[PDB]
Amino acid sequence: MNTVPFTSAPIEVTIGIDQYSFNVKENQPFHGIKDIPIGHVHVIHFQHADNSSMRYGYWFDCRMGNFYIQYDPKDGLYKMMEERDGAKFENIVHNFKERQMMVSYPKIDEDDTWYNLTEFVQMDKIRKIVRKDENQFSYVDSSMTTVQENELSDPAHSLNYTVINFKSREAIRPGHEMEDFLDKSYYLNTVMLQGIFKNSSNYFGELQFAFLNAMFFGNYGSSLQWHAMIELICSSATVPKHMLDKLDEILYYQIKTLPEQYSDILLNERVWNICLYSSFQKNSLHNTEKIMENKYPELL
Amino acid sequence: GAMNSSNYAELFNNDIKLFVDDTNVYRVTVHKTFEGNVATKAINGCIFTLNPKTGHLFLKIIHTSVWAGQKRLSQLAKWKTAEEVSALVRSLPKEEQPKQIIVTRKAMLDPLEVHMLDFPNIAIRPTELRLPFSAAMSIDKLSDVVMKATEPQMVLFNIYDDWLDRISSYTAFSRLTLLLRALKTNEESAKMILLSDPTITIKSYHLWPSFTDEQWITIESQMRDLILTEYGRKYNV
Ligand SMILES: O=C(O)CCOc1ccccc1
Numbered sequence: 001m002n003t004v005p006f007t008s009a010p011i012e013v014t015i016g017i018d019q020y021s022f023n024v025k026e027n028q029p030f031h032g033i034k035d036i037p038i039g040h041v042h043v044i045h046f047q048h049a050d051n052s053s054m055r056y057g058y059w060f061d062c063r064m065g066n067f068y069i070q071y072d073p074k075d076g077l078y079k080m081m082e083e084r085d086g087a088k089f090e091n092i093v094h095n096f097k098e099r100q101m102m103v104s105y106p107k108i109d110e111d112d113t114w115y116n117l118t119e120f121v122q123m124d125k126i127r128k129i130v131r132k133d134e135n136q137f138s139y140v141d142s143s144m145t146t147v148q149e150n151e152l153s154d155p156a157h158s159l160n161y162t163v164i165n166f167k168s169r170e171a172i173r174p175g176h177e178m179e180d181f182l183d184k185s186y187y188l189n190t191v192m193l194q195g196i197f198k199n200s201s202n203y204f205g206e207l208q209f210a211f212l213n214a215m216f217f218g219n220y221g222s223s224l225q226w227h228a229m230i231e232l233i234c235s236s237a238t239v240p241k242h243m244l245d246k247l248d249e250i251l252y253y254q255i256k257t258l259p260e261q262y263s264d265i266l267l268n269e270r271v272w273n274i275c276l277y278s279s280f281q282k283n284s285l286h287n288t289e290k291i292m293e294n295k296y297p298e299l300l
Numbered sequence: 301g302a303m304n305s306s307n308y309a310e311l312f313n314n315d316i317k318l319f320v321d322d323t324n325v326y327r328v329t330v331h332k333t334f335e336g337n338v339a340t341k342a343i344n345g346c347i348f349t350l351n352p353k354t355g356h357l358f359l360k361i362i363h364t365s366v367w368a369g370q371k372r373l374s375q376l377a378k379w380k381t382a383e384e385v386s387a388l389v390r391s392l393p394k395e396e397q398p399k400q401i402i403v404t405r406k407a408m409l410d411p412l413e414v415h416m417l418d419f420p421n422i423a424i425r426p427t428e429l430r431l432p433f434s435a436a437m438s439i440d441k442l443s444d445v446v447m448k449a450t451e452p453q454m455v456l457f458n459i460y461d462d463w464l465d466r467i468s469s470y471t472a473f474s475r476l477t478l479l480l481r482a483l484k485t486n487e488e489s490a491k492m493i494l495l496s497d498p499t500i501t502i503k504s505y506h507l508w509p510s511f512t513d514e515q516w517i518t519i520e521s522q523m524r525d526l527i528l529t530e531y532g533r534k535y536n537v
Pocket residue numbers: 354355356357358456457458461
């Protein structure tokens with residue numbers, strides 16, 4: 001188990017840790033989160049009570065170092081930092097617990113939800129999408145645009161998702177215009193899987209990361225990417241069988257976790273009707289289709 | 301963006317543009333089989349591609365052989381249209397290539413955009429004008445060359461004859477669309493209006509009769525009356 005201590009909590013805030021959330025009052029004696037299952041990936045996110053504008057947070061792998069949060073009264077946000085003095089860090093986190101001003105990460109043992117949402121999500125791939133090499137953790141917020149979106153304005157502060165554009169030369173072989181537009185299997189299998197992602201694990205990892213940034217931060221470009229990566233698979237007549245079966249599982253847990261009152265803004269009706277009812281893989285997403293019809297029939 | 305009547309004069313500025321109409325690409329007769337079924341047989345079609353400033357009509361004849369052994373022909377027809385228009389653009393010198401292509405049917409947008417990926421600076425747009433280019437096959441000389449074709453073929457015409465010697469491209473386009481709307485609304489009566497004086501002839505290289513300026517005013521009036529007459533008949537007005 002790891003700990004993410006907080007120096008203090010000067011401003012009232014809603015704090016997320018993975019799929020969980022809790023509130024902290026202004027200047028409440030709060031000193032962080034204890035009992036965190038070491039994983040391969042985690043996210044800590046924030047939405048200020050006095051200004052729900054800018055949700056923001058930090059992706060981090062507990063195995064890559066000792067991380068803490070400190071409020072910056074100049075920039076006005078909770079910042080993640082890394083503590084390089086391990087003995088100092090053990091001195092805090094073996095005490096702050098001994099003071100009991102930390103909340104306990106509350107993992108129900110039946111609940112495998114977080115690795116079903118992040119199995120393929122990796123921190124080394126996150127740091128390629130979010131380029132800030134001097135830190136081992138990665139900042140994302142509600143307003144960050146994607147590299148693709150920038151091509152249609154601070155590149156340093158962008159989300160470097162893999163560009164997917166169905167009406168581009170990358171997607172369409174000269175001489176195969178109709179074929180490749182109506183059946184995107186070339187673009188999926190040769191261009192994306194073989195050429196760029198190298199395997200389906202890296203593809204699913206970006207898809208999962210995009211979903212979680214859309215949900216946790218309301219990041220619009222992330223939502224676009226999530227949907228585009230689903231639509232590319234569903235619009236392909238030829239997809240490995242392991243990939244389809246795995247996609248159904250991945251999407252089912254995303255739909256299950258989605259806040260019910262957030263469906264008007266996190267689900268694109270066009271994409272979902274195409275994937276479930278019209279696409280080559282309409283009959284391959286059995287569990288996702290079943291949760292979508294019984295949870296969000298209004299969208300369909 | 302989409303075209304309409306606010307920015308309507310723009311069609312006749314100096315930026316080259318091309319209307320594309322695909323409504324006559326895939327054409328059939330609908331007939332009954334020996335088992336009592338109904339079956340289609342394709343007949344020759346055409347792509348109608350028109351630069352409205354110059355009157356230059358690039359009429360690509362679509363021979364029935366292009367459909368042989370193909371499925372989902374209405375869908376294929378849009379992609380075939382897109383393929384041929386892209387080829388037309390590539391065959392033109394750069395200073396003759398359009399800056400915009402306006403499609404009369406929104407279903408042509410994605411096929412044309414995909415075939416035109418090599419030309420990122422050519423805008424592909426729908427329009428909100430209801431243009432009567434489907435009635436191109438009511439123009440006798442166009443119909444004849446389409447139905448006589450035994451192979452794919454590209455035929456060129458100035459669809460304005462010599463009118464630009466005397467009137468503007470705006471005025472010529474208005475005359476064209478009036479004639480074609482009339483032919484679409486009541487083809488046989490519209491043809492009667494045009495052919496009723498056998499002493500006014502069609503030049504060998506023209507599509508329309510050699511009317512004087514005053515005769516065109518009379519013809520245009522008779523065409524407007526035909527269209528209004530049919531409206532009244534249709535809606536009991
Ligand atoms: O302007 C004219 O009448 C002679 C040129 O006519 C053309 C017609 C179609 C394509 C190219 C030229």
